Amino acid sequence: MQRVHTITAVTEDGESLRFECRSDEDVITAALRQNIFLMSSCREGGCATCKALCSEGDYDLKGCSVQALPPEEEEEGLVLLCRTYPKTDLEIELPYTH
């Protein structure tokens, strides 16, 4: 009936986790529902510093101020964990790294 999902998210800052979440994957919602409590940053789509990365999974990620900057070249640059869609996320790196 429902589709199960597994989010593997490791921060290049040095954190690494593999949780379970169905229907609504969302690395924040799933690990907020499992036991941990993460948080991207401002979620305003205007910093361009949180250059996160996406290993695999068809999940979605859309900037917030697209009318200031298109997220294409920024997507082909890397991925942003400020939006994070729960469509299908298999493995993702966090927005921090160093």
Ligand code: FES
């Ligand atoms: S747009 Fe502000 S840290 Fe992501």
